[PDB]
Structure 1
Amino acid sequence: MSHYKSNVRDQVFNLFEVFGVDKVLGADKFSDLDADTAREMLTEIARLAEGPIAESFVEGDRNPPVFDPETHTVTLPEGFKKSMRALFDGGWDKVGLAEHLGGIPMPRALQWALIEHILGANPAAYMYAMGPGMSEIFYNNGTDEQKKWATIAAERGWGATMVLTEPDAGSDVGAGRTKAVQQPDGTWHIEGVKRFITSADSDDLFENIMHLVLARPEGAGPGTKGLSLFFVPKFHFDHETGEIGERNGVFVTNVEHKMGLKVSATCELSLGQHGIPAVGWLVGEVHNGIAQMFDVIEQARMMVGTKAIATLSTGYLNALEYAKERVQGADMTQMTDKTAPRVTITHHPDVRRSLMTQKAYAEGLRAIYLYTATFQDAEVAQAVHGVDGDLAARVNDLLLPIVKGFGSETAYAKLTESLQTLGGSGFLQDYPIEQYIRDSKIDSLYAGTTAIQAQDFFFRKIIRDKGQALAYVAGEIEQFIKNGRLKTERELLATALADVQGMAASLTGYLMAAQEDAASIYKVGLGSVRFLMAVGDLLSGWLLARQAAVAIEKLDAGATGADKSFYEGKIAAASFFAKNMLPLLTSTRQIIENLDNDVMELDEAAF
């Protein structure tokens, strides 16, 4: 089969046996989608991923897109376009889309589980397919007139882009200088050069592309607050009929050559620089740009995290399958005997250490993003968590930089163990892991760098939140800890929780002391990422231990066969994660408790 190895079994286990998302299925908003249909949906997109979607994974990397300066367009390899047609023909770009736009209603937890398969098999395919979802965001933010245009864009499956970054403005979005000039007829002319725009052109995949463009109206103030969001289509079109008209002045001028994710066209995009204006329409006919744009950013951050987790999962399973077949060496209990029987490398302790490390972090990360997704629907959050809409939103916002930052960083690091498991053959393009590594390196960078995620997590999602979302999560961990076979795990989780509370308190002190000693805030920065990673480790450990508790109940009730093996691995992974990952948080707390500004006072020249 393909490079892509899916894990529907683990998804369903999470959705049903752990979090109880089936308990909203079949009723009210989900009245026409039951537990059986949901599972059949996941099996169906998994087969599509493993089949036609994954089939062009290698081709997209080896035969990447080409920019044509003679038409300012991009050409995509034929095999990949065939994969995109499979994705559209099955309607998959419209699941979790609102019903009035043609979508099938469902819990966000099920939606992201479905998308995992596309991100595992060929992640750029999903990125090119994000158009209808951005049309929906345009709808929810648009005037009534604009809501008709967005409906046309979704129904016709136009592509879309998120257009923020400029050469001098990436992390600092508010430094952007792309300009908006209001016209007598109420439209705007956008003038600027944007950089690194994913899917800014898409060959002939779609009949139009909606660029959602941040730009500074003439006379507006500085920073992100001065920005507005504009609907800037690639082609003008009839506002009632949708018929495609003349070309608008928004042109790709280059495509970047990248380490990976090569089949995703990453483009420099010029607005109003080629002799015709880039006409835009103020979204909502209100000036509220960064706020509107962050509806898009939040989705993109969820997607990047889920992508990284999807890639590690298929990386692990590839590594595992390889280890099961590769004969090399004697059993360590016979290491001195040179006539001893050769064994498969799963018999070797370092390999099992490596595989269990890969397994626990992949499964722990899947649990994290599905858990994050159970707070993205007010009604799921009520039904499975007992929390109201306001708390749910804050808990989701707390968890997003974890999915994104902890997910991106952990997936790329643990794929190293996946490649290591293949020995020298892991360094070959013949196997998919080296491409997994190159494709996933970008996950720590776009949709906001790990450092930006760590800062949002602490400053905005904890401090500004007054700790409500964090206090909720920590309280759920504490309950699990208070409650036999899982006593050691609970004791280790107790230590990890205290360690994370200690780190939170040290950083809070550094921040609060900045009122009387400005440079104190630097210690917050020095510690932020390690703190984010620690909370990620804590969540992984908790959720795996929760999985183990369910697995114990299921084995006690008589699980057999393949089910019994699955449950047994949950117990093993949870125990291994508690005994091998969690204790390091203690040293990390002590390190964060002793941070100082020596590294900040050093002359730049001494580096």
Structure 2
Amino acid sequence: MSHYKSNVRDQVFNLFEVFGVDKVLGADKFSDLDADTAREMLTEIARLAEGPIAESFVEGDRNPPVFDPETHTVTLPEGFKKSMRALFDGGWDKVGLAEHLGGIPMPRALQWALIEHILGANPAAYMYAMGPGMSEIFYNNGTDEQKKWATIAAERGWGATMVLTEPDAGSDVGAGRTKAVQQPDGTWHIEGVKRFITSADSDDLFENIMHLVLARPEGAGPGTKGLSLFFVPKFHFDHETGEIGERNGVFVTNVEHKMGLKVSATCELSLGQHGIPAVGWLVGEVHNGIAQMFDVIEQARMMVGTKAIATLSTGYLNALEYAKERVQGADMTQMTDKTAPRVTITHHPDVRRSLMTQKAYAEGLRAIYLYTATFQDAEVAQAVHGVDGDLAARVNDLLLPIVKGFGSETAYAKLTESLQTLGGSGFLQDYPIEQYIRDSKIDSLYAGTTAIQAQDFFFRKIIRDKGQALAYVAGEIEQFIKNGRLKTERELLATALADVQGMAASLTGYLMAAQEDAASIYKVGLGSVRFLMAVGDLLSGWLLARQAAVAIEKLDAGATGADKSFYEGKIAAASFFAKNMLPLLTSTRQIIENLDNDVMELDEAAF
């Protein structure tokens, strides 16, 4: 079979046995979707991901997209286009799409679990297929007239792009110089060159593409808040019928050569530089670009983190299958006996340490993104957590930099253990892990670098939030702590919580001390990413412990066979993570408590 090793068993356990998302299924917005159908959908997309979607994982890498300068188009490999079709023909492009655009209503915790499987099998496939959901974002932000266009874009399944980055404006989006010039008929002419645009062309996958392009109107202010968002389609079209018309002046001029994620065309997007204007329409006919664009950035950040977690999961499972089957060496209890029976490497403790590490973090991460997703529907947050819409929004925003930044960095780091398990064979392309790594290194970069995530997590999602969302999550962790076979984990989780509390209190000191000493703010930057990672380790230990608490209930209730084995591994993962991962936060708090600006005062030439 294929490279993509699924785990719907773990998804359902999270959705149903731990977070209780089924408690909303069958009622209200999800009236016509019951718990059984949800499991069947999860099983269906997992089989589609393992088959036709994973079919072209290797081809997309070894036979990558090509730029045609004769036509300013991109060619994609045949096998990848075949997988794209399999996804369209199942309607898996309409996941969580609003009902009035042809989607099936769902809790987003379910939606992202469905999404995970595509991202584990062929992540670029899902990215090419985010058009409809970006069309919906255009709908929510559009005028009534534009809402008709957006509807056409969703129903005909046009592709879509996020167009922010320029050569001199990446994390500083506000530094972009692309301009918008208003015309007499109310349209705008966009003029500029954007860089690193995903899916900017897609060969003949779609009949049109919607480019969501950020630009600065003539005479607008500086920074992000001078920016406006424009709807710029690859082709002109009839605003009633949808009939595709004349080519619009927005062309790809180049296709990057990347370490991984190769079948994802990443292009220089040139607007107006080829003899026809790039006409764009101002979204909602208001000047509000960076706020509007962030509805899409927020989705992209959720996707990138889930992708990372999706890829660590099948990394681990590939490594496990290999370890179970590979004979090498004697049991360590028989080390000196050179006649002793050879063993499979799962008998070797460093192998078992590295499998338990991959397992605990993979499953720990899956819980986080699903937990995060239970705060994205007001109805689910109320039903499962008892929190009103405003608190739900805030905790979702708090948790996104975790899903993206902590997921980003952990999945790549732990795939090293994945590959390691294969011994020398991990370095061969014959096995999928080296590509998992190359495909995953980008997740720490696009949709905001990890540092950008950490600076958002602290400055916006905590400080500007006055600690409300952070205080709410800490409250749930404390409640689990204060409540037998779980006493030791709880003791370690209590240390870990104090440690994170320590780190937050320390950093906030450095920040508010900056008013009498401006250089103090650098200590916030020096610690922000480490603080983010600790919060991600704290959440993983907590969520993993919750899961063990339930596995104990189900075991005491008499689970047997394959179920028993599953629940037994939750206990193992939870105690391992408590004992081997969490303690390191104590020394991290202390390191953060003793930060200084020596590294800032040092002259650049001394590096």
Query: Does TM-score exceed 0.5, indicating one fold?
Result: yes
**C-alpha separation in 2, matches of 1:489 and 1:115:** 32
**C-alpha separation in 2, matches of 1:134 and 1:231:** 11
**C-alpha separation in 2, matches of 1:80 and 1:369:** 27
Per-residue displacement from partner, 1:208-257 (whole Å, max 9, x unpaired)?
00000000000000000000000000000000000000000000000000
Per-residue displacement from partner, 1:535-569 (whole Å, max 9, x unpaired)?
00000000000000000000000000000000000
Offset of 1:325 from its aligned partner?
0.1
Per-residue displacement from partner, 1:349-377 (whole Å, max 9, x unpaired)?
00000000000000000000000000000
Counterpart of 2:61 in 1: which secondary structure? helix
**C-alpha separation in 1, matches of 2:469 and 2:336:** 56
Alignment of 1:428-577 (within 5 A): 428-577=428-577
Counterpart of 2:169 in 1: which secondary structure? coil
Per-residue displacement from partner, 1:143-201 (whole Å, max 9, x unpaired)?
00000000000000000000000000000000000000000000000000000000000
Offset of 1:70 from its aligned partner?
0.4
**C-alpha separation in 1, matches of 2:523 and 2:412:** 26
Equivalent position of 1:305 in the other structure: 305
Equivalent position of 1:157 in the other structure: 157
**C-alpha separation in 2, matches of 1:598 and 1:338:** 55
Per-residue displacement from partner, 1:439-472 (whole Å, max 9, x unpaired)?
0000000000000000000000000000000000
Counterpart of 1:166 in 2: which secondary structure? coil
Counterpart of 1:94 in 2: which secondary structure? coil
Per-residue displacement from partner, 1:393-450 (whole Å, max 9, x unpaired)?
0000000000000000000000000000000000000000000000000000000000
**C-alpha separation in 2, matches of 1:452 and 1:566:** 37
Counterpart of 1:340 in 2: which secondary structure? coil
Runs (4+) off by over 3 Å:
none
- Name stretches of at least 5 consecutive residues in structure 2 with no aligned partner: none
Equivalent position of 2:314 in the other structure: 314
Per-residue displacement from partner, 1:78-118 (whole Å, max 9, x unpaired)?
00000000000000000210000000000000000000000
Equivalent position of 1:185 in the other structure: 185
Pairs aligned (count): 607
Counterpart of 1:92 in 2: which secondary structure? coil
Per-residue displacement from partner, 1:278-297 (whole Å, max 9, x unpaired)?
00000000000000000000
Per-residue displacement from partner, 1:106-141 (whole Å, max 9, x unpaired)?
000000000000000000000000000000000000
Counterpart of 2:336 in 1: which secondary structure? coil
Counterpart of 2:588 in 1: which secondary structure? helix
**C-alpha separation in 2, matches of 1:432 and 1:347:** 24
Per-residue displacement from partner, 1:244-275 (whole Å, max 9, x unpaired)?
00000000000000000000000000000001
Offset of 1:345 from its aligned partner?
0.1
**C-alpha separation in 2, matches of 1:178 and 1:6:** 43
TM-score normalised according to structure 2 size = 1.00
Equivalent position of 2:51 in the other structure: 51
**C-alpha separation in 2, matches of 1:29 and 1:258:** 42
Counterpart of 2:139 in 1: which secondary structure? helix
**C-alpha separation in 2, matches of 1:96 and 1:397:** 19
Counterpart of 1:67 in 2: which secondary structure? strand
**C-alpha separation in 2, matches of 1:245 and 1:590:** 63
**C-alpha separation in 2, matches of 1:121 and 1:521:** 42
**C-alpha separation in 2, matches of 1:562 and 1:535:** 33
Counterpart of 1:61 in 2: which secondary structure? helix
**C-alpha separation in 1, matches of 2:439 and 2:299:** 19
RMSD: 0.2
Offset of 1:47 from its aligned partner?
0.1
**C-alpha separation in 2, matches of 1:339 and 1:401:** 53
Counterpart of 2:93 in 1: which secondary structure? helix
Counterpart of 2:38 in 1: which secondary structure? helix
Per-residue displacement from partner, 1:472-523 (whole Å, max 9, x unpaired)?
0000000000000000000000000000000000000000000000000000
Per-residue displacement from partner, 1:547-606 (whole Å, max 9, x unpaired)?
000000000000000000000000000000000000000000000000000000000000
Per-residue displacement from partner, 1:46-79 (whole Å, max 9, x unpaired)?
0000000000000000000000000000000000
**C-alpha separation in 2, matches of 1:35 and 1:421:** 37
**C-alpha separation in 1, matches of 2:425 and 2:198:** 32
Alignment of 1:59-458 (within 5 A): 59-458=59-458
Counterpart of 1:140 in 2: which secondary structure? helix
**C-alpha separation in 1, matches of 2:552 and 2:33:** 30
**C-alpha separation in 2, matches of 1:322 and 1:49:** 21
- Name stretches of at least 5 consecutive residues in structure 1 with no aligned partner: none
**C-alpha separation in 2, matches of 1:345 and 1:147:** 58
Counterpart of 1:359 in 2: which secondary structure? helix
Counterpart of 1:281 in 2: which secondary structure? strand
Counterpart of 1:469 in 2: which secondary structure? helix
Counterpart of 2:252 in 1: which secondary structure? strand
**C-alpha separation in 1, matches of 2:436 and 2:158:** 28
